[PDB]
Design a binder for this molecule. Structure first.
Ligand SMILES: [Cl-]
Length: 396
Protein backbone atom coordinates (compact mmCIF):
# COMPACT_ATOMS: atom_id res chain seq x y z
CA UNK A 1 0.00 0.00 0.00
CA UNK A 2 2.53 2.55 -1.21
CA UNK A 3 2.48 5.51 -3.56
CA UNK A 4 5.83 6.79 -4.74
CA UNK A 5 6.02 10.59 -4.59
CA UNK A 6 7.89 12.39 -7.34
CA UNK A 7 8.67 16.03 -7.91
CA UNK A 8 9.12 16.09 -11.67
CA UNK A 9 11.94 13.61 -12.30
CA UNK A 10 13.15 13.44 -8.73
CA UNK A 11 11.99 10.85 -6.24
CA UNK A 12 10.89 12.68 -3.03
CA UNK A 13 9.73 9.79 -0.90
CA UNK A 14 6.81 7.40 -0.31
CA UNK A 15 3.26 7.65 1.02
CA UNK A 16 2.24 4.49 2.89
CA UNK A 17 -1.28 3.48 3.96
CA UNK A 18 -1.07 0.82 6.73
CA UNK A 19 -3.64 -1.94 7.24
CA UNK A 20 -5.24 -0.07 10.14
CA UNK A 21 -5.87 2.83 7.77
CA UNK A 22 -3.18 5.15 9.17
CA UNK A 23 -1.22 7.20 6.63
CA UNK A 24 2.53 7.70 6.89
CA UNK A 25 5.22 9.30 4.73
CA UNK A 26 8.97 8.83 4.50
CA UNK A 27 11.42 10.96 2.57
CA UNK A 28 13.87 9.26 0.25
CA UNK A 29 17.54 9.32 1.28
CA UNK A 30 18.62 10.65 -2.08
CA UNK A 31 16.09 13.43 -1.64
CA UNK A 32 17.34 14.38 1.85
CA UNK A 33 20.98 14.34 0.61
CA UNK A 34 20.49 17.23 -1.84
CA UNK A 35 21.71 20.57 -0.62
CA UNK A 36 18.58 21.90 -2.34
CA UNK A 37 16.11 19.50 -0.71
CA UNK A 38 12.75 20.97 0.26
CA UNK A 39 9.87 19.40 2.23
CA UNK A 40 6.66 18.24 0.50
CA UNK A 41 4.90 20.62 2.90
CA UNK A 42 5.91 22.98 5.68
CA UNK A 43 3.73 20.64 7.81
CA UNK A 44 5.93 17.64 6.84
CA UNK A 45 9.46 18.90 7.56
CA UNK A 46 12.50 17.10 6.18
CA UNK A 47 13.49 14.20 8.44
CA UNK A 48 14.79 10.65 8.08
CA UNK A 49 12.18 8.75 10.04
CA UNK A 50 8.63 7.83 9.21
CA UNK A 51 6.18 10.70 9.68
CA UNK A 52 2.99 9.49 11.27
CA UNK A 53 1.22 12.66 12.43
CA UNK A 54 -2.26 13.55 11.18
CA UNK A 55 -0.47 16.13 9.00
CA UNK A 56 0.31 13.32 6.53
CA UNK A 57 -3.30 12.36 5.93
CA UNK A 58 -4.43 15.98 5.98
CA UNK A 59 -1.84 17.02 3.44
CA UNK A 60 -2.81 14.39 0.89
CA UNK A 61 -6.54 14.74 1.57
CA UNK A 62 -6.15 18.47 0.78
CA UNK A 63 -5.00 17.61 -2.77
CA UNK A 64 -8.49 16.27 -3.50
CA UNK A 65 -11.77 18.13 -3.99
CA UNK A 66 -13.54 18.85 -0.63
CA UNK A 67 -17.03 17.80 -1.80
CA UNK A 68 -18.15 14.22 -1.12
CA UNK A 69 -20.36 14.41 -4.25
CA UNK A 70 -17.34 15.11 -6.42
CA UNK A 71 -15.38 12.28 -4.79
CA UNK A 72 -18.14 9.79 -5.65
CA UNK A 73 -17.84 10.94 -9.27
CA UNK A 74 -14.11 10.28 -9.19
CA UNK A 75 -14.65 6.77 -7.88
CA UNK A 76 -17.14 6.12 -10.67
CA UNK A 77 -14.88 7.60 -13.36
CA UNK A 78 -11.93 5.33 -12.63
CA UNK A 79 -13.70 2.58 -10.70
CA UNK A 80 -11.51 3.60 -7.74
CA UNK A 81 -11.19 0.81 -5.16
CA UNK A 82 -13.07 2.99 -2.67
CA UNK A 83 -13.90 6.55 -1.59
CA UNK A 84 -10.70 6.72 0.48
CA UNK A 85 -8.10 9.45 -0.30
CA UNK A 86 -5.22 7.03 -0.83
CA UNK A 87 -7.38 5.15 -3.34
CA UNK A 88 -8.49 8.33 -5.11
CA UNK A 89 -4.87 9.56 -5.42
CA UNK A 90 -3.92 6.12 -6.81
CA UNK A 91 -6.21 6.95 -9.76
CA UNK A 92 -5.73 10.69 -10.35
CA UNK A 93 -2.47 11.49 -8.59
CA UNK A 94 -0.22 11.75 -11.64
CA UNK A 95 -1.08 15.42 -12.27
CA UNK A 96 -2.02 17.33 -9.12
CA UNK A 97 -1.91 20.82 -7.74
CA UNK A 98 1.71 21.68 -7.20
CA UNK A 99 4.43 19.24 -8.10
CA UNK A 100 3.33 16.10 -6.31
CA UNK A 101 3.15 13.18 -8.70
CA UNK A 102 1.89 10.00 -7.06
CA UNK A 103 2.64 6.78 -8.97
CA UNK A 104 1.56 3.23 -7.83
CA UNK A 105 8.39 11.70 -22.59
CA UNK A 106 6.65 15.02 -23.36
CA UNK A 107 3.76 14.01 -25.58
CA UNK A 108 0.08 14.73 -26.00
CA UNK A 109 -3.16 14.26 -27.92
CA UNK A 110 -4.74 17.24 -29.64
CA UNK A 111 -8.50 17.49 -29.11
CA UNK A 112 -10.98 18.55 -31.77
CA UNK A 113 -13.76 20.97 -30.77
CA UNK A 114 -16.16 18.07 -30.73
CA UNK A 115 -13.75 16.04 -28.60
CA UNK A 116 -13.08 18.94 -26.22
CA UNK A 117 -16.80 19.43 -25.69
CA UNK A 118 -17.17 15.77 -24.80
CA UNK A 119 -14.26 15.87 -22.40
CA UNK A 120 -15.58 18.86 -20.55
CA UNK A 121 -19.16 17.70 -20.31
CA UNK A 122 -18.00 14.82 -18.09
CA UNK A 123 -17.12 17.39 -15.43
CA UNK A 124 -20.18 19.87 -6.37
CA UNK A 125 -18.06 22.06 -8.64
CA UNK A 126 -15.47 19.57 -9.97
CA UNK A 127 -12.61 21.13 -11.93
CA UNK A 128 -10.28 19.49 -14.42
CA UNK A 129 -7.16 20.43 -16.36
CA UNK A 130 -5.82 20.31 -19.90
CA UNK A 131 -2.56 20.95 -21.70
CA UNK A 132 -2.57 23.94 -24.08
CA UNK A 133 -0.24 23.59 -27.14
CA UNK A 134 -0.45 26.70 -29.32
CA UNK A 135 -4.13 27.40 -29.85
CA UNK A 136 -5.22 23.82 -29.18
CA UNK A 137 -6.42 22.03 -26.08
CA UNK A 138 -4.87 18.65 -25.45
CA UNK A 139 -4.74 15.67 -23.18
CA UNK A 140 -1.17 15.05 -21.96
CA UNK A 141 0.31 11.57 -22.17
CA UNK A 142 2.06 9.74 -19.34
CA UNK A 143 3.38 12.11 -16.67
CA UNK A 144 3.31 15.09 -19.07
CA UNK A 145 1.67 17.95 -17.14
CA UNK A 146 -1.40 20.06 -17.80
CA UNK A 147 -1.11 23.87 -18.11
CA UNK A 148 -4.61 25.08 -17.29
CA UNK A 149 -7.35 24.49 -14.68
CA UNK A 150 -10.69 24.26 -16.50
CA UNK A 151 -13.84 25.28 -14.69
CA UNK A 152 -17.44 24.81 -15.69
CA UNK A 153 -20.33 27.03 -14.54
CA UNK A 154 -21.49 26.32 -10.96
CA UNK A 155 -24.21 30.87 -10.12
CA UNK A 156 -24.92 29.89 -13.74
CA UNK A 157 -22.59 32.69 -14.81
CA UNK A 158 -19.66 31.78 -12.55
CA UNK A 159 -17.29 31.29 -15.54
CA UNK A 160 -17.99 34.83 -16.72
CA UNK A 161 -17.93 36.14 -13.14
CA UNK A 162 -14.45 34.72 -12.40
CA UNK A 163 -13.13 35.82 -15.80
CA UNK A 164 -14.19 39.40 -15.09
CA UNK A 165 -12.78 39.34 -11.57
CA UNK A 166 -9.42 38.00 -12.71
CA UNK A 167 -9.23 40.66 -15.44
CA UNK A 168 -10.06 43.39 -12.90
CA UNK A 169 -7.58 42.09 -10.39
CA UNK A 170 -4.83 42.12 -13.04
CA UNK A 171 -5.79 45.68 -14.11
CA UNK A 172 -5.47 46.81 -10.50
CA UNK A 173 -2.00 45.35 -10.03
CA UNK A 174 -2.76 42.11 -8.22
CA UNK A 175 -0.72 38.98 -8.92
CA UNK A 176 -3.32 36.70 -10.55
CA UNK A 177 -3.26 34.12 -13.35
CA UNK A 178 -4.39 34.94 -16.87
CA UNK A 179 -7.53 33.17 -17.95
CA UNK A 180 -9.59 32.75 -21.02
CA UNK A 181 -13.19 31.86 -21.74
CA UNK A 182 -13.32 28.80 -23.96
CA UNK A 183 -16.23 27.62 -26.04
CA UNK A 184 -16.51 24.12 -27.36
CA UNK A 185 -19.85 23.44 -28.99
CA UNK A 186 -22.40 24.30 -26.36
CA UNK A 187 -19.95 24.30 -23.45
CA UNK A 188 -18.63 27.59 -22.04
CA UNK A 189 -15.75 27.08 -19.58
CA UNK A 190 -13.01 29.09 -17.88
CA UNK A 191 -9.41 28.05 -18.63
CA UNK A 192 -7.11 29.45 -15.92
CA UNK A 193 -3.36 29.36 -16.62
CA UNK A 194 -1.59 27.40 -13.92
CA UNK A 195 1.16 29.09 -11.91
CA UNK A 196 2.31 25.67 -10.57
CA UNK A 197 3.68 24.92 -14.08
CA UNK A 198 6.52 26.45 -16.06
CA UNK A 199 7.82 25.69 -19.57
CA UNK A 200 11.63 25.58 -19.90
CA UNK A 201 13.21 28.10 -22.22
CA UNK A 202 13.35 25.87 -25.28
CA UNK A 203 9.73 24.68 -24.71
CA UNK A 204 10.77 21.02 -24.71
CA UNK A 205 9.93 20.36 -21.09
CA UNK A 206 7.00 21.49 -18.95
CA UNK A 207 7.93 21.51 -15.26
CA UNK A 208 5.77 21.35 -12.16
CA UNK A 209 6.34 23.87 -9.31
CA UNK A 210 5.76 22.80 -5.65
CA UNK A 211 3.02 24.62 -3.81
CA UNK A 212 0.57 24.09 -0.97
CA UNK A 213 -2.44 25.91 0.38
CA UNK A 214 -2.82 27.36 3.84
CA UNK A 215 -4.63 24.44 5.30
CA UNK A 216 -1.69 22.24 4.17
CA UNK A 217 0.97 24.62 5.41
CA UNK A 218 -0.56 24.56 8.88
CA UNK A 219 -1.26 20.76 8.90
CA UNK A 220 -5.03 21.33 8.97
CA UNK A 221 -7.89 19.35 7.43
CA UNK A 222 -9.96 21.08 4.72
CA UNK A 223 -12.85 20.94 7.22
CA UNK A 224 -11.50 23.94 9.08
CA UNK A 225 -10.70 26.11 6.06
CA UNK A 226 -13.12 28.79 7.31
CA UNK A 227 -12.20 31.04 10.17
CA UNK A 228 -15.54 30.41 11.87
CA UNK A 229 -14.57 26.74 12.05
CA UNK A 230 -11.15 27.49 13.59
CA UNK A 231 -9.28 28.03 10.31
CA UNK A 232 -6.63 30.69 9.73
CA UNK A 233 -7.63 34.24 9.15
CA UNK A 234 -5.78 37.45 8.33
CA UNK A 235 -3.77 37.47 11.58
CA UNK A 236 -2.40 33.98 11.35
CA UNK A 237 -1.59 34.29 7.63
CA UNK A 238 0.07 37.70 8.03
CA UNK A 239 2.20 36.27 10.91
CA UNK A 240 3.12 33.33 8.71
CA UNK A 241 4.06 35.62 5.80
CA UNK A 242 6.74 37.12 8.04
CA UNK A 243 8.79 33.98 7.32
CA UNK A 244 8.29 34.31 3.55
CA UNK A 245 11.33 34.84 1.33
CA UNK A 246 9.27 37.79 0.02
CA UNK A 247 7.75 39.04 3.34
CA UNK A 248 7.37 42.73 2.60
CA UNK A 249 5.86 42.08 -0.81
CA UNK A 250 3.66 39.16 0.27
CA UNK A 251 2.23 40.99 3.27
CA UNK A 252 1.50 44.03 1.14
CA UNK A 253 -0.11 41.89 -1.58
CA UNK A 254 -2.14 39.88 0.94
CA UNK A 255 -3.45 43.06 2.58
CA UNK A 256 -4.16 44.62 -0.81
CA UNK A 257 -6.10 41.48 -1.73
CA UNK A 258 -8.30 41.81 1.42
CA UNK A 259 -9.25 45.31 0.25
CA UNK A 260 -9.83 43.92 -3.27
CA UNK A 261 -12.13 41.14 -2.02
CA UNK A 262 -14.14 43.67 -0.11
CA UNK A 263 -14.53 45.90 -3.19
CA UNK A 264 -15.68 43.04 -5.39
CA UNK A 265 -17.81 41.32 -2.76
CA UNK A 266 -15.77 38.09 -2.84
CA UNK A 267 -17.22 36.26 0.17
CA UNK A 268 -15.46 32.95 -0.15
CA UNK A 269 -11.82 33.81 0.47
CA UNK A 270 -11.11 31.00 2.89
CA UNK A 271 -7.74 29.53 3.79
CA UNK A 272 -7.54 27.16 0.81
CA UNK A 273 -7.77 30.16 -1.51
CA UNK A 274 -4.21 31.11 -0.56
CA UNK A 275 -1.07 29.16 -1.28
CA UNK A 276 2.70 29.35 -1.13
CA UNK A 277 5.43 28.10 -3.44
CA UNK A 278 7.85 25.82 -1.55
CA UNK A 279 11.30 26.62 -2.86
CA UNK A 280 14.58 24.80 -2.85
CA UNK A 281 15.95 24.56 0.67
CA UNK A 282 12.48 24.87 2.16
CA UNK A 283 11.90 28.63 1.90
CA UNK A 284 8.46 29.81 0.71
CA UNK A 285 6.59 32.74 -0.80
CA UNK A 286 2.98 33.57 -1.72
CA UNK A 287 1.62 32.27 -5.02
CA UNK A 288 -0.73 34.47 -7.14
CA UNK A 289 -4.33 34.74 -5.91
CA UNK A 290 -6.99 32.53 -7.47
CA UNK A 291 -10.60 31.21 -7.35
CA UNK A 292 -11.92 34.76 -7.37
CA UNK A 293 -15.70 35.14 -7.65
CA UNK A 294 -17.92 38.11 -6.80
CA UNK A 295 -21.16 37.59 -4.89
CA UNK A 296 -22.62 40.73 -6.49
CA UNK A 297 -24.15 38.87 -9.47
CA UNK A 298 -26.09 36.72 -7.07
CA UNK A 299 -27.77 39.68 -5.36
CA UNK A 300 -31.53 39.85 -5.87
CA UNK A 301 -31.45 36.49 -7.61
CA UNK A 302 -33.69 35.04 -4.90
CA UNK A 303 -33.59 37.06 -1.69
CA UNK A 304 -29.85 37.53 -1.01
CA UNK A 305 -29.22 41.14 0.03
CA UNK A 306 -26.05 43.20 -0.09
CA UNK A 307 -26.31 43.39 3.71
CA UNK A 308 -26.00 39.57 3.76
CA UNK A 309 -22.50 39.61 2.11
CA UNK A 310 -19.69 38.83 4.53
CA UNK A 311 -15.93 38.48 4.11
CA UNK A 312 -14.70 34.94 4.89
CA UNK A 313 -11.81 36.49 6.90
CA UNK A 314 -12.94 39.30 9.12
CA UNK A 315 -11.19 42.58 9.86
CA UNK A 316 -10.71 44.31 13.22
CA UNK A 317 -13.62 46.33 14.59
CA UNK A 318 -13.74 48.40 17.77
CA UNK A 319 -15.86 45.74 19.49
CA UNK A 320 -14.69 42.55 17.83
CA UNK A 321 -14.57 41.76 14.15
CA UNK A 322 -15.91 43.50 11.05
CA UNK A 323 -17.32 41.12 8.38
CA UNK A 324 -20.20 42.78 6.48
CA UNK A 325 -19.02 44.18 3.17
CA UNK A 326 -21.75 46.82 3.38
CA UNK A 327 -20.48 48.04 6.80
CA UNK A 328 -16.79 48.03 6.03
CA UNK A 329 -15.00 51.35 5.50
CA UNK A 330 -11.29 52.29 5.31
CA UNK A 331 -10.99 52.62 9.10
CA UNK A 332 -11.39 48.81 9.46
CA UNK A 333 -8.48 48.10 7.17
CA UNK A 334 -6.34 50.69 8.89
CA UNK A 335 -7.18 49.33 12.35
CA UNK A 336 -6.34 45.84 11.16
CA UNK A 337 -2.97 46.87 9.66
CA UNK A 338 -2.04 48.43 13.03
CA UNK A 339 -2.56 45.41 15.21
CA UNK A 340 -0.83 43.26 12.59
CA UNK A 341 2.16 45.63 12.32
CA UNK A 342 1.51 46.33 8.67
CA UNK A 343 2.91 49.83 8.02
CA UNK A 344 0.18 52.45 7.99
CA UNK A 345 1.77 54.31 5.09
CA UNK A 346 1.41 51.11 3.02
CA UNK A 347 -2.21 50.56 3.98
CA UNK A 348 -2.82 54.17 2.95
CA UNK A 349 -1.10 53.61 -0.37
CA UNK A 350 -3.25 50.56 -1.00
CA UNK A 351 -6.43 52.46 -0.23
CA UNK A 352 -5.23 55.53 -2.21
CA UNK A 353 -4.29 53.45 -5.24
CA UNK A 354 -7.72 51.79 -5.42
CA UNK A 355 -9.32 55.20 -4.92
CA UNK A 356 -7.86 56.74 -8.01
CA UNK A 357 -7.44 53.64 -10.22
CA UNK A 358 -10.72 51.79 -9.87
CA UNK A 359 -12.81 53.95 -12.26
CA UNK A 360 -10.29 53.53 -15.07
CA UNK A 361 -9.73 49.80 -14.35
CA UNK A 362 -13.45 49.07 -14.67
CA UNK A 363 -13.59 50.74 -18.09
CA UNK A 364 -10.36 49.08 -19.23
CA UNK A 365 -11.63 45.57 -18.37
CA UNK A 366 -14.55 45.98 -20.81
CA UNK A 367 -12.34 45.81 -23.88
CA UNK A 368 -11.23 42.32 -22.83
CA UNK A 369 -14.78 41.02 -22.57
CA UNK A 370 -16.10 38.93 -25.46
CA UNK A 371 -19.09 40.15 -27.43
CA UNK A 372 -21.37 37.57 -25.75
CA UNK A 373 -20.20 38.48 -22.24
CA UNK A 374 -23.29 38.81 -20.01
CA UNK A 375 -24.08 42.46 -19.29
CA UNK A 376 -25.90 41.64 -16.09
CA UNK A 377 -22.57 40.42 -14.70
CA UNK A 378 -20.78 43.64 -15.57
CA UNK A 379 -23.61 45.81 -14.26
CA UNK A 380 -23.89 44.00 -10.97
CA UNK A 381 -20.16 44.00 -10.32
CA UNK A 382 -19.37 47.44 -11.71
CA UNK A 383 -22.25 49.13 -9.90
CA UNK A 384 -21.46 47.59 -6.52
CA UNK A 385 -17.67 48.16 -6.79
CA UNK A 386 -18.28 51.82 -7.61
CA UNK A 387 -20.62 52.13 -4.66
CA UNK A 388 -17.97 50.79 -2.29
CA UNK A 389 -15.21 52.71 -4.11
CA UNK A 390 -16.96 55.92 -3.08
CA UNK A 391 -15.98 55.17 0.53
CA UNK A 392 -12.29 55.28 -0.53
CA UNK A 393 -12.51 58.31 -2.79
CA UNK A 394 -14.17 60.24 0.07
CA UNK A 395 -11.14 59.76 2.34
CA UNK A 396 -8.43 59.25 -0.31
CL1 LIG B 1 -19.67 43.91 10.44
Amino acid sequence: PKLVTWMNNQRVGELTKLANGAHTFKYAPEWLASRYARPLSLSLPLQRGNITSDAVFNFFDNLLPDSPIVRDRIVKRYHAKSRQPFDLLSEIGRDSVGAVTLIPIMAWEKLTEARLEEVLTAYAQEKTALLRIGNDWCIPKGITPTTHIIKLPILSQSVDNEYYCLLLAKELGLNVPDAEIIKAGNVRALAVERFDRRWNARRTVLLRLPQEDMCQTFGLPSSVKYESDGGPGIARIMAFLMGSSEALKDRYDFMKFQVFQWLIGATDGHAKNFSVFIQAGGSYRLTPFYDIISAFPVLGGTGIHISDLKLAMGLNASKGKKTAIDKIYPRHFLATAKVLRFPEVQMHEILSDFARMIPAALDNVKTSLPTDFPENVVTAVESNVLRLHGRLSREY
